[PDB]
Design a protein around this ligand. Structure first.
Ligand SMILES: CC[n+]1c(-c2ccccc2)c2cc(N)ccc2c2ccc(N)cc21
Lengths: 172, 181
C-alpha cells in the first residue's frame, strides 16, 4: 500500500530474517530498494522507524479483532476474538518486537491501547475466582500463540485446532 | 582443583544476544565480551555451531536441575507437570527466552531441548482421541502462556497475581483422586 507502509513491512520482515540490531538505514535501503534519502523522508530516525513498526503491528491486531468480534461490547465475545487471533502461531518479527517493546517507553505505549481494550483486567484477581477463570483462558491462548517457539516440536494443524476448540470451551 | 572458562563463555554468549543479537555473536564479538582470546574460545568451542549448541545444552540442563530439585515424584506424568508449572514462579531472563525461541533454527538445538522436555513436558500423543490428554495439554498451554506473559503483554502480573494464576493452572490439572458415590 503506502510507500510508508511498504517500508515498515520490509523492516518487520527484515528483523525476522536477520535481527533488530542490524536493522539500519543501510540494510533497510538494500531491502526496500530505496535510498537512505528516501527513507529519511518518511522516517527521520531509527527510533521513529521502530516506533512505526510497533504501531503497525498493534494496529494490525486491533483491526483483526474488530473484524471478527461479534459484539465488541460483550466481554465474552472480545475474549473469544482474542483466543481466535492468538490461535495462529506468532511470526518471528512480531514475537521479537513484543519481547523488545520495553526497550523504550514509546514502543510499550504503541501497544497500550490495544492491550487495554482487548486483554481482560485482573482487578482483585487474588479474590475473584471468575476473574482468574477468565485470565486462565488468556494464558492458554497466549501459550498456543507462542507454542511452536518454546517447545522442541510444533503442533500439527489438527492438534492446534483441537486445542483451540478446547480453549474456547474453557471460557466461562 | 583445575577449572575452565567454559561456563563463563557460555553465560557471556547468552547475555550477549540480549544486548545485541545471535546474528552478530561471533568469535570476535565473544572475545571482546569475555576478555578472552579467540584461541581461548576455540579451545572449548571449535565452531560457532558448537558454541550455539553448548548454549542450548546449558539452559536445558539448568531447567532439568530445577525440575528434579522441585519434583515430588518423577514417576507420575502429572507430578512432572506440576513441577513444570511450579518453575513459573519467577520469570526467565530475556536473553534466555531469546535463545530458546531460536532453537527451531537447527535440529541439533531442538534436540538439546527434547532431551529434557521428554522427561517433563506432556506429549500430545493421541491428543484428538483422548479428552483427558487435551485437558492435560490445556494445562501445558496455560503454563506456556504464564511463561511468556510478562514479555508479550504490557500489563505485568504482580508477584501476588502471578502466584494466584500459578495456583489456578495447578487447579486445572486433572484429578487423580477417586470419589465414593
Ligand atoms: C524449555 C523452555 N522453557 C523454560 C526454560 C528453561 C531453560 C532456559 C530457558 C527457558 C522454562 C523456564 C522456567 N523457569 C519456567 C517455565 C519454562 C517453560 C515452560 C513451558 C515451555 N514450553 C518451555 C519452558
Amino acid at each position: 500500500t503506502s510507500k510508508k507502509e511498504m517500508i515498515l513491512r520490509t523492516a518487520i520482515d527484515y528483523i525476522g530474517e536477520y535481527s533488530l540490531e542490524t536493522l539500519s538505514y543501510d540494510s533497510l535501503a538494500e531491502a526496500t530498494g530505496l535510498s537512505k534519502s528516501g527513507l529519511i523522508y518518511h522516517f527521520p530516525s531509527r527510533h521513529a522507524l521502530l516506533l512505526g513498526m510497533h504501531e503497525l503491528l498493534a494496529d494490525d491486531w486491533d483491526k483483526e479483532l474488530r473484524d471478527i468480534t461479534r459484539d465488541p461490547e460483550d466481554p465474552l465475545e472480545r475474549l473469544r476474538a482474542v483466543v481466535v487471533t492468538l490461535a495462529e502461531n506468532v511470526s518471528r518479527p512480531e514475537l521479537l518486537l513484543l519481547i523488545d517493546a520495553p526497550s523504550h517507553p514509546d514502543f510499550l505505549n504503541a501497544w497500550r491501547t490495544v492491550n487495554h481494550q482487548w486483554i481482560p483486567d485482573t482487578d482483585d484477581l487474588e479474590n475473584d475466582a471468575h476473574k482468574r477463570a477468565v485470565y486462565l483462558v488468556q494464558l492458554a491462548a497466549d501459550g498456543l500463540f507462542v507454542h511452536d517457539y518454546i517447545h522442541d516440536d510444533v503442533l500439527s494443524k489438527s492438534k492446534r485446532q483441537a486445542m483451540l476448540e478446547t480453549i474456547l470451551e474453557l471460557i466461562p
